[model samples]
Target: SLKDMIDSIEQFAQTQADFPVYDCLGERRTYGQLKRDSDSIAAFIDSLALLAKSPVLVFGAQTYDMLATFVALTKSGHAYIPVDVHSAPERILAIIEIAKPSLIIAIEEFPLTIEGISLVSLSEIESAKLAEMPYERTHSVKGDDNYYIIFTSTGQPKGVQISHDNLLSFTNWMIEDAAFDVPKQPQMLAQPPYSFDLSVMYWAPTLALGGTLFALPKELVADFKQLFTTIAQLPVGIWTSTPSFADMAMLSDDFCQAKMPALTHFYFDGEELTVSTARKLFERFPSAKIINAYGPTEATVALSAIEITREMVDNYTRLPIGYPKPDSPTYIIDEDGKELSSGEQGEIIVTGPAVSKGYLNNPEKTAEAFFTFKGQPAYHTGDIGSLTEDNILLYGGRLDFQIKYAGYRIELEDVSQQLNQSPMVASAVAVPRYNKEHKVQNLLAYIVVKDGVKERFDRELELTKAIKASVKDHMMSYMMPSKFLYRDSLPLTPNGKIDIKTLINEVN
Candidate 1:
């Protein structure tokens, strides 16, 4: 037997109707209000000539309405497609071309009106509610039906369809895993925009547990003072953010435990958690558990996680990604499609209910990345990894970017991680310089040196040579960067990943 996400959430409305389930910095929505609001939108959908079982687009601004509207679409048996307001018109156009959604639910103001697509504004939805008009689960998304389709932002934007079953495995894993056994009614932070699946890390478990969702709006994101003060005021107990966002908080003295006492857990995913961040968090929020997790959007949020411990930090050069969840068992396979021995380097593979069946409407890309393993749906993670004897998972880097430099295989991610360990380095990455034959000629390092250290040296030349000499201790001889290019900052994509492809294109 299994459970339904909508049913599980509605039970809270029945049991504790007046309980506040959403808190957008003092603006609140009770569970009862949520049900009623959702009912209103679902009723409107039922009245529409819109195609059933087809997806609908929700133009969102990471507001509270986006959450309720997603629920409404679910009750109406339509998989909601979230299009962030910040996304470019080009990206939105890409989504429209790919998704061909039945209609658009505009919570955020629309910039353009497409010719034929029906548009439902926020006011229309607010006006249409019957207060207590019931919306049934009669035609709601269930079982293998697509619950929502999130388009990956990386490139051509392949739509990844996550079903009720895929999400159940993930939500259940978060609630049940010892590493993240979030208590009922816990107050969790919701900062990531809704378009990215990482937001699911905040919303899914929070909603499932009948917990309060504390949101940080897009406007406040650019204001450091307000962002820090707003977080200090919230009674948030569980925190989820990318490693970069947490590092931004580290700049404020008000971010410590005394000001934010309710903060007990820090969940880091979407980006790698550096030792520097983990160490700083240990000092400021000593009582909190700083969890490091790993997964792709296609895998339905993160599937592997582990709490960083002081002793474990002292002994290991690289922290482990923890064991796989019970449903999604992980294994390492070599390039030749052979299962490698434990502790041997290889690509990571995962299979079970958590894995997506395939990319939506793209069979070639789907066939290239997904397959059947152990009689279950599986995904080829393209990530290089290995497993220890005790079953600890260690990430090496992306299989796509690892290159053979001077006949020695080197992962560029290793170069950057080792570079960060250097005391003088601020932010860094390793990029390969290519020769006429399109082979790696020399490995180049792009870095932002720490504030005072660059000035301490006589000239820029002195600082560059000094950094390379000291950074070798943590790096292998073959993996060392041949040149160091110091800069104010590294180029970054909007998605928070290092813009390696941008640099790669520049190099070639």
Candidate 2:
């Protein structure tokens, strides 16, 4: 069946020669074009004469050329490591030092400062270094061989190593046992950086089903009018993004209108999917089915999901991350490794064939993260959640960050949402500090306000006043932020998540 799937793709290239493959930068590359270009790139890799299992670091943002390089690596029987160009020079250098990549392919220009590293730009690989020999045939690599290495957002951002079989298994799981049935040839919209596992939520499903992937033009992201116009031109049927991206879109013109009339299936799971946001999107696109998915990079993209409707939204504020995939195993367990009863908070653990092998270089970290659970290699999700009576999984917060303030555990994410809904605050984070005796010290609330707004307005104290009122109804006073720091924008990581660590470092 695996061979059949691969053969089907190769065979399709012969018949469906002109079908849309990838739409990016105003040029829609057809299937025929991809086939030719990929073949050329694969031949170039072969010409390099690299040894088996040698690492190849792919550096750049999400672009057609970056996608081609990855495919070409797979076709050429090589493992590909994705390194975001936006990553700190030290982190990039550290990864390079560890992986010792046999080759580094830059989709864009490689900075001149990083010297003594053997590298080739995408321009060089695609145009200048065209292989003299014909394209080499692609045979399936071993199940244990490295397929792709992605870095996760743990403190050190360890590399997650997946095998060819593992990746194929992940894609197959989505197709066969996906939370919701994807439409026939569902046109996908590329949303995340190719490095983020979220990209696969769109990439694999679309390519497997012989659908096209439309890359949202980067320049238009800051310009709402041009962006909606582009979305209007393309007939994207399946939409996928994080809650943050969707929220940003809500601030744009295309949202809540008849613009994306063709849009049908909506999928999101990377960050928390609050009922408040879910209701907004559901009301805006009444026809679209919403899937609240949950997963980690260790589990590819998704491990569990729940389908939502207008009725469900009205009844419940928090939706459960439904049961595991048909064959996957997921559970909520206490610290002692015991499964908890419904409504009891515990850590979420995942076990399945799709779980990544382990971290690439750090065996100690890998052992701690992926360990034996009920005699199976399970991944510790480190997320605090609970199962409902009807088997719905409700997320609370990160296990490490769970704060016991005034005897009641408070979810920082809940605080963030409340701030998002606040009229005075544009963004916020509530961080709880603990004393040496494990008691609550104080909670600090970091608020980013809109332009021309000040924390203290005459006698208003706008944000504090709003939070003071909100705390009374929504949160406990003990969990409220004792101090509020106003900023023009929230500190963000290279991957674009709010950098809580940097905020803590700067303030405390």
Candidate 3:
């Protein structure tokens, strides 16, 4: 099927005058235009004759050129690595050390960084110098050769790798389920950074179906009004993003009316999807297909999807992450290799073409991650889950440093959800600060009150109590936080997710 698509692209370019693709930033590019440009870029890259399929890292801000470089590298039969521009140079440098990429395609000017490492600027392309040259077609790439390598956030500021085969498998799965019927429907509102693996989820399906993608401006995400007006104009049918963006968008009255009118489908990932939030979305866009996806970087985009209906949300606490993607098989296994019975908890294991070959080149980690049992390469997601009698996957706790205090076995996510639900609270994080013995110690809930509420220490206290009560009533008590601590705002990591480590360090 991939080859068929590639062949079609070749045929499309050979005969067509132009196949235009537009970016939300107002950049329109024709496929013929891309083909010619990409061909020359490929030649320039290939001129290095680096080892075939060696990883080439694409670093920096989101732009049409960065997207072009990603397509060109993959089409040229090379795997492009994504290094979020927002990542600290130290973190990016660490990735370089581990991946040892063949080249780094930076949007910024390159200097002598890594010895013998080549760099190119996608933004500074000079078409005049090479438009006359014939297109250097990729007539030789085999299916096994990688197309791209996306790096995802690991706890320690490191990133995980997902390959082309893995990505395509997930993309194809979504294509079968996605709809682009509205005029310009299925237009992707690219909100996450290119470095965030979720962007690929949007890219693959949108491009495969000939839909449009509008990359949200980097600075305007928090400015709900601007984002709402932009969404209102598009012939938008589907929106793919984290729950944070959707919740924020829904906060605006204008956003509720104008921006969401054209939305018919919602594909959410990158974080947990609470029943309350999903209900808010459903109430606003009743016709939209709301999918609750679950996965880590190792399993392409996601391993599971739930098509949440109105009745289910009203009845359930958390939306079940329905089932694995097409061709994906999921297993819930205990500490031993035994599979858990229905309604029993265990680590989530995913086996599929979408599963990564293993962590880039770390053999020990690769072995630890891609363990083989009875001859099947299986990925053990650090996240925990249990299956329902009806075969839906329910999320549990993470196996890592995640806390399990109060009774619900704490998910920093659950507490954060409750805190933000409060009218006075802007954001929050809950971490269990352990004593030296590393015992299950006390928990602290940190929060930032809303604007103009700086003096509302009393309001924060009341809100904290309200949040706790809400959690206790909604979730189990063991899951409710023990202590409440308010802050101006939560710290942020390079990728812009809440900086839990810094908060822990400061509190400890």
lDDT of every predicted structure (CA atoms): 0.84, 0.73, 0.66
TM-score, structure 2 vs. true:
0.88
Pairs in clash, predicted candidate 2: none
Worst 10 residues of 2 by lDDT: 1-10
The candidate, 1 or 3, that scores higher on lDDT is: 1
Q: RMSD to native for every prediction?
A: 1.9, 3.4, 3.7
Q: Which ten residues in a row have the lowest lDDT in candidate 1?
A: 489-498
Residue pairs with backbone atoms closer than 3 Å in model 3 (clashes)? 19-31, 20-30, 264-288, 406-478, 407-478, 408-478, 408-479
Q: By descending TM-score, how would the candidates be arranged?
A: 1, 2, 3
